[PDB]
Amino acid sequence: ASGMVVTDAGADQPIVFVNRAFSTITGYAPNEVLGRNQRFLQGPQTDAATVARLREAIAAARPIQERILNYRKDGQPFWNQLSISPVRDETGNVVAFVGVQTDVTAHHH
Amino acid sequence: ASGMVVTDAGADQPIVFVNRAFSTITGYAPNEVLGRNQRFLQGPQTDAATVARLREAIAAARPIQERILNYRKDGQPFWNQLSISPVRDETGNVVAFVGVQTDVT
Numbered sequence: 070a071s072g073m074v075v076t077d078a079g080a081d082q083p084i085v086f087v088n089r090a091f092s093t094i095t096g097y098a099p100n101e102v103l104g105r106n107q108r109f110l111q112g113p114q115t116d117a118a119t120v121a122r123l124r125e126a127i128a129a130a131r132p133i134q135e136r137i138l139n140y141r142k143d144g145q146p147f148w149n150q151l152s153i154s155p156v157r158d159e160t161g162n163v164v165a166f167v168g169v170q171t172d173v174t175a176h177h178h
Numbered sequence: 179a180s181g182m183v184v185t186d187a188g189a190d191q192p193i194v195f196v197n198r199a200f201s202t203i204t205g206y207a208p209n210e211v212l213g214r215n216q217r218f219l220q221g222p223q224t225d226a227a228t229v230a231r232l233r234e235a236i237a238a239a240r241p242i243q244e245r246i247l248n249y250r251k252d253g254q255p256f257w258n259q260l261s262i263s264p265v266r267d268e269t270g271n272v273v274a275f276v277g278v279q280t281d282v283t
């Protein structure tokens with residue numbers, strides 16, 4: 070099951086919703102992450118160029134997909150196949166962002 | 179400001195999230211709508227053909243826009259410029275649906 074998050078469109082994109090699979094993948098309960106920017110999933114081995122691409126895409130409200138190294142609440146690394154899309158109304162205003170997270174790590178084999 | 183709703187993909191698409199503007203437009207609070215199908219916004223003069231077009235697009239996970247007559251909690255009719263999009267993972271599975279509601283009355 071893939072994680073899904075909704076964030077606000079404005080002012081550093083606080084989380085406003087996560088699905089159950091997001092908790093399964095990340096180790097965080099919904100109420101521990103509401104109101105926060107998703108960058109808390111990053112850590113020292115996260116690729117800075119990837120993060121830069123995300124930063125520029127979100128600022129421009131452009132869809133973006135990346136495979137990014139993230140970290141569970143407990144510190145356990147996982148590779149995140151991440152897809153972010155703006156949600157627009159019919160006059161083009163960005164209402165929110167949606168993010169999908171798939172854990173693509175081979176954890177056990 | 180436009181309303182936004184997120185539903186689950188299966189099991190008759192219950193609401194799992196609404197934004198502030200959804201409540202401004204519709205008169206329902208989040209707690210009144212979570213877990214329900216969005217069709218509670220329809221009423222007596224809602225166009226049946228429009229509803230069927232939405233039904234088919236959701237079943238096929240196809241994006242669709244309709245101008246549909248809906249009803250505020252207090253029963254007042256309003257024209258809903260509605261856009262629905264599937265949310266997919268990178269292998270194509272539908273994870274959720276997103277709806278965007280503009281009151282264009």
Ligand SMILES: Cc1cc2nc3c(=O)[nH]c(=O)nc-3n(C[C@H](O)[C@H](O)[C@H](O)COP(=O)(O)O)c2cc1C
Nearest residue numbers: 076082106107108110111120123124166167168170
């Ligand atoms: C909807 C949404 C979901 C996001 N999900 C993730 C994620 O799962 N993992 C991640 O490392 N960053 C994720 N981000 C990106 C970070 O929140 C942040 O935008 C990125 O690190 C670039 O900003 P920064 O350089 O200011 O940290 C997400 C962003 C948005 C808008």
Ligand SMILES: Cc1cc2nc3c(=O)[nH]c(=O)nc-3n(C[C@H](O)[C@H](O)[C@H](O)COP(=O)(O)O)c2cc1C
Nearest residue numbers: 185191215216217219220229232233236275276277
């Ligand atoms: C994300 C999402 C948002 C929806 N928003 C609305 C809405 O604002 N108004 C509406 O009349 N129907 C809306 N619908 C459509 C109804 O939920 C339902 O799918 C439609 O009436 C056709 O199905 P039915 O014949 O089973 O009722 C939405 C559906 C989804 C999946």
